[PDB]
Design a protein around this ligand. Structure first.
Ligand SMILES: Cc1cc2nc3c(=O)[nH]c(=O)nc-3n(C[C@H](O)[C@H](O)[C@H](O)COP(=O)(O)O)c2cc1C
Ligand SMILES: Cc1cc2nc3c(=O)[nH]c(=O)nc-3n(C[C@H](O)[C@H](O)[C@H](O)COP(=O)(O)O)c2cc1C
Ligand code: NI
Ligand code: NI
Ligand code: NI
Ligand code: NI
Lengths: 192, 192
């Protein structure tokens, strides 16, 4: 092997495969909003998320199949991904509490919501960026449901975009490390 | 609507749906290694990635179908996800150059690799965390291929784990904002 490879031959440790998600971090933490058939708003944070296709715009996120978010999407086929700025990190955290079905956790979080342009579920006012999505497919994978969706509409808060990109320095997106540990992503470093 | 919703009724702007991935940021940037049938090592960075299932461990990442990474997985059905620490950000960036097929971009990047425990493709020495994966499914989605994989093995560098989580403070994982802009995720903030 290469000399570098040779001297590190002992620097590695086996790590539990069921803790794999803890190595693939930090991850963007988003609040996903949905509605049930009665129109009740539901909101919850998710950190297993990622874009999939640029054009057509298709995004994805993984949810436990039992979550209100999972079940609402299965029945109303829509959801809005809301970016989480650090200024409301404690509030998004509250939206994770196990609030009764049909109840809007945005209320208990002291967050506000406004209508979306193309879908039923709302956009969170405090969120600087929103991705209005239409269900594509809900593939079941292990203990989660891989949910992909077509982005039919996108909106941003004034000043949240810098040169076409999310103005992280301003927005300071919340990233999940694991448990109650997070990373505020306001550290811009260009490669050039 | 709520008073908060009312005063923000004009604070939002429509945003191109084909720029949706730019709102869902910053994202973990990983170098995925694979091999072709001849055993040639290939390495490339990806920022559309996310865990999917915790147990069984299933991870995912999106790649252009034409990439060497996509084609290698299709033929050898394996790949290793390698976390990118900020100390080699310029080097991982080089692995993105359009190096000829069959050529190992790790070499041109001045990076080293060592054998994996369960799969053919290698683990990058400079990477503090590795996820050895076996292809699960390569669902085509728009202009990308959603690739999921079973994590058959995981390994970390000594000191890269703090209380079961990726020691971001030490590792300083590289997060992609878009283009050549990144975020070093070494800003731990607990919610409590
Ligand atoms: C930062 C953070 C990230 C989370 N990410 C996920 C995730 O990716 N997938 C998931 O299934 N649950 C995730 N959760 C847990 C859910 O938010 C939680 O189970 C919530 O009660 C679900 O609400 P619902 O039943 O109204 O959908 C996360 C929680 C927090 C605090
Ligand atoms: C920070 C960063 C993130 C990237 N993320 C992705 C991604 O998620 N999906 C993708 O298809 N290409 C992505 N790319 C581009 C590929 O790395 C690039 O096309 C590379 O040449 C692919 O190599 P391959 O053909 O050897 O697989 C990214 C590049 C950089 C610098
Ligand atoms: Ni709920
Ligand atoms: Ni429908
Ligand atoms: Ni290549
Ligand atoms: Ni095979």
């Amino acid at each position: 092997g290469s000399q570098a490879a040779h001297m590190m031959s002992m620097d590695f440790e086996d790590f539990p495969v069921e803790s794999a998600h803890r190595i693939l971090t930090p991850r963007p933490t988003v609040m996903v909003t949905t509605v049930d058939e009665e129109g009740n708003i539901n909101a919850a944070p998710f950190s297993f998320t990622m874009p999939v296709s640029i054009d057509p715009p298709v995004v994805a996120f993984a949810s436990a199949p039992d979550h209100h978010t999972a079940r609402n999407i299965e029945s109303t086929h829509e959801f809005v991904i809301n970016i989480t700025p650090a200024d409301i990190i404690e509030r998004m955290w509250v939206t994770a509490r196990d609030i009764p079905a049909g109840e809007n956790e945005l209320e208990a979080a002291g967050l506000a919501w406004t209508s979306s342009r193309r879908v039923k579920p709302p956009r969170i006012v405090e969120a600087p960026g929103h991705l209005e999505c239409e269900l594509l497919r809900m593939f079941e994978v292990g203990d989660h449901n891989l949910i992909t969706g077509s982005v039919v509409s996108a909106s941003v808060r004034s000043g949240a975009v810098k040169e076409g990109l999310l103005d992280v320095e301003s927005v300071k997106p919340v990233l999940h490390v694991g448990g109650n540990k997070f990373v505020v992503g306001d550290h811009v470093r260009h490669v050039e």
